[PDB]
């Protein structure tokens, strides 16, 4: 009636193939803003593209942040300023996504599978914001992360199989939150192991369509547990 959502989606897929994720994200942002619930394909496109786009800035933030600490005065300032450029781009990305999540995506999610997917993502992007938060803003950002993950965690425990990839991705990311952000290794390992153990206990009844994805996360869950102990 005013714009074209199906063409935005095609353009997201074409941006994807062309490996132009910033372009990609902007299509999926525009598509989410049309207000209609996102099919499983669109959902992935949204996630993949904001993942790539933020993931480059995070990666970059680290490399430049480590060089800042490992240093005399003037090259340390240059790194400090380049770091800050990078955080601003990072924050703008997180802010765009969190807004789509809270405004359009989460409240219009009708199935429990999607409500958990989006709440997980909510916590993910709050988490990314906490990885670069300055002192005074850090606390409240961390809390926003935790509440989102918590509310996702509980819906999955009541409504999903413990072998389900999204439940397991939630479990993984939530444990990593506790470990890397809250510096709480006992809650971390416990959450990981419990969610690992419960998955193996239904590894028999594992579907083709949801097998590669579950196993992979189970592996990651383990590698993490290994590293953390």
């Amino acid at each position: 009636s005013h714009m074209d959502k199906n063409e935005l989606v095609q353009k997201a897929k074409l941006a994807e193939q062309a490996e132009r994720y910033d372009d990609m994200a902007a299509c999926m942002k525009s598509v989410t803003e049309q207000g209609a619930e996102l099919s499983n394909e669109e959902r992935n496109l949204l996630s993949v593209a904001y993942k790539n786009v933020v993931g480059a800035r995070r990666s970059s933030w680290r490399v430049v942040s480590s060089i800042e600490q490992k240093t005399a005065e003037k090259k340390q300032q240059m790194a400090r300023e380049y770091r800050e450029k990078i955080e601003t781009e990072l924050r703008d990305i997180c802010n765009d996504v969190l807004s789509l999540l809270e405004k359009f995506l989460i409240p219009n999610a009708s199935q429990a599978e999607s409500k958990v997917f989006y709440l997980k993502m909510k916590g993910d992007y709050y988490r990314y914001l906490a990885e670069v938060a300055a002192g005074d803003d850090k606390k409240g950002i961390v809390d926003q992360s935790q509440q989102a993950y918590q509310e996702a965690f509980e819906i999955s425990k009541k409504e999903m199989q413990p072998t389900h990839p999204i439940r397991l991705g939630l479990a993984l990311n939530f444990s990593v939150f506790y470990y890397e952000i809250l510096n709480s290794p006992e809650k971390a390992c416990s959450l990981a192991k419990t969610a690992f153990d419960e998955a193996i206990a239904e590894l028999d009844t594992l579907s083709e369509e949801s097998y590669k994805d579950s196993t992979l996360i189970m592996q990651l869950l383990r590698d993490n547990l290994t590293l953390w102990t």
């Binding site: 992935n44 993984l172 990311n173 444990s175 890397e180 990651l220 590698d223 953390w228």
Partner: peptide, 7 residues
Amino acid sequence: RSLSAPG
């Protein structure tokens, strides 16, 4: 660092 879920 720790590992997180992939898209």
